[PDB]
Amino acid sequence: SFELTQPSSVSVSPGQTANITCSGGYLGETYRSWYQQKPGQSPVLVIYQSSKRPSGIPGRFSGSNSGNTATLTISGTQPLDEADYFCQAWDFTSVVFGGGTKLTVLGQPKAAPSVTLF
Amino acid sequence: SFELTQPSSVSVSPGQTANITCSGGYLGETYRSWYQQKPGQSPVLVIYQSSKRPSGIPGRFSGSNSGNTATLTISGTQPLDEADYFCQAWDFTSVVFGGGTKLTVLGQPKAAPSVTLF
Amino acid sequence: SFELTQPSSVSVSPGQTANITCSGGYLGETYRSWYQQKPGQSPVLVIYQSSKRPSGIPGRFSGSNSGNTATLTISGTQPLDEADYFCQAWDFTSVVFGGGTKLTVLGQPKAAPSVTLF
Amino acid sequence: SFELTQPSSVSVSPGQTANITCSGGYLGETYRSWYQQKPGQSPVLVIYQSSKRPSGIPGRFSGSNSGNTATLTISGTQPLDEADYFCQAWDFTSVVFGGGTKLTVLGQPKAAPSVTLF
Amino acid sequence: SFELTQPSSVSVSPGQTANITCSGGYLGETYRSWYQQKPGQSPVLVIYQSSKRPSGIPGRFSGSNSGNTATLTISGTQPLDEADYFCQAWDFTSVVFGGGTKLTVLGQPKAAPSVTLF
Ligand SMILES: *[C@@H]1O[C@H](CO)[C@@H](O)[C@H](O)[C@H]1NC(C)=O
Ligand SMILES: *[C@@H]1O[C@H](CO)[C@@H](O)[C@H](O)[C@H]1NC(C)=O
Numbered sequence A, B, C, D, E: 001s002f003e004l005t006q007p008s009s010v011s012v013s014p015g016q017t018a019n020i021t022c023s024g025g026y027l028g029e030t031y032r033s034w035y036q037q038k039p040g041q042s043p044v045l046v047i048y049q050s051s052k053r054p055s056g057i058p059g060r061f062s063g064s065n066s067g068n069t070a071t072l073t074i075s076g077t078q079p080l081d082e083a084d085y086f087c088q089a090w091d092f093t094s095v096v097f098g099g100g101t102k103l104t105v106l107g108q109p110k111a112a113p114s115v116t117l118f
């Protein structure tokens, strides 16, 4: 009596586990006395954009492209007064497998005993 | 008596587990006395955009393209007074498999014992 | 007596599990005394957009394209007074399999014992 | 006596499980005394848009295209007073399989024992 | 009697585990007396952008490209007064497998004992 056992286990299980927490804290203000005099608050902001014949990736493929061509990003630039930003901008990008990928998983266990018993 | 067992297990199970939390905290204000005098609050903001013949990816494929061509993003730029932003902008992008991917999973276990017993 | 068992299990089960929570907190204000005098609040905002012959992806395919051509996004830019934004903008994009993907899963277990017993 | 068992299980079951919660909190205001004088509140906002021969994807296919051509988005830009935004804008996009996908699942287990017993 | 056992285990399970925490602390202010006089607050900010024939990756593929072509990023630049930024900008990018990758996992254990016993 013979036993042939081949518990082949081809396992692909990538995974990210995250405990993510933001706490704004405790902000206490007691017996605050104030006298604020701000006449003539006249901020000026001028943004000008001109473009001619812009291009990006004018060639062969780019697998993953998060970069840009000539662009403009403006965030939180000119806060004048009592501006509170708590956990304001959280950008989380979790990628297990990127772009332009070829996955060829071949799990084909072979067991063909050529047994002759006489 | 013989036993042939091949519990082939081809398992692809990627997964992300996340505990995500935002707490704005405790904001206490007791006996706040205030005198605010702000005549003539005249902010000015001018945004101008001109484009001519813009292009992006004028070539072969891009697998994943989150980047842009000449664009403009404006967020939270000019808050004047008592502006509170708590967990304001949360951008979460979780991708298991990206774009432009070819997955060929071949689980074809083979067991053909050529047994002769006489 | 012989037993042939091949419990082939071809399993593709990717999945993301998320506990997501926003709590605006506790905002307490007791015995607040105020005197606010703001004559002549005259904000000015001018947005101008002109485009000529814009284009995007004038070529071969793009698998996934979340990026843009020349565009303009304006969010929360000029809040004047007592403006509260709690968990205001949450953008969640969870993709298991992206665009432009070819999945060929072939689970064809084979068991043909050529048994001769005499 | 022999037993041939092939419990082939070809299972494709991707799935996302989410506990999603927003709580605006507790906002308490006791004994608030106020004197607000705001004559002549005259905000001005001018938005101009002109386009000529715009185009997008004037080529081969795009699998999934969430990006735009020259567009304009305006959200929450100019809130003047006592403006509260709680869990205001939630954009959730959960995609299991994207666009432009070809799925060929072939589960065809084969068991043809060529048994000769004499 | 003989036993042949080959518990082949081909396991690919990369994963990142993270405990992430932000606490804004405790901010206490008691018996604050203030006299603020700021007439004529007139900040000026001028941003000009001009581009002609920009290009990026006008050649063969780039596997992963997070870098940009001539762009402009403006963040938190000119905060005038009482501007608090707590855990303001958190950019987390966790990638298990990058772009432009070819994964060929071949788990095909072989066990064919040529046994002759007579
Ligand atoms: C952290 O995550 C683990 C499991 O990954 C869990 O046991 C624990 O409760 C989590 N703690 C926090 C504070 O999120
Ligand atoms: C964290 O998630 C784990 C399971 O992943 C769960 O046991 C626990 O209760 C969660 N805790 C929080 C604070 O979300």
Ligand SMILES: *[C@@H]1O[C@H](CO)[C@@H](O)[C@H](O)[C@H]1NC(C)=O
Residues within 6 Å of the ligand: C017, C018, C019, C020, D019
């Ligand atoms: C977290 O999710 C787990 C299961 O994933 C569940 O046991 C637990 O109650 C959840 N907790 C919260 C706070 O959402």
Ligand SMILES: *[C@@H]1O[C@H](CO)[C@@H](O)[C@H](O)[C@H]1NC(C)=O
Residues within 6 Å of the ligand: D017, D018, D019, D020
């Ligand atoms: C979280 O979801 C789990 C199952 O996924 C459930 O047991 C639990 O009650 C949920 N909790 C909340 C707070 O949504």
Ligand SMILES: *[C@@H]1O[C@H](CO)[C@@H](O)[C@H](O)[C@H]1NC(C)=O
Residues within 6 Å of the ligand: A019, E017, E018, E019, E020
């Ligand atoms: C840290 O994570 C571990 C598991 O990775 C968990 O036991 C523990 O509770 C976490 N602690 C904190 C403070 O997040």
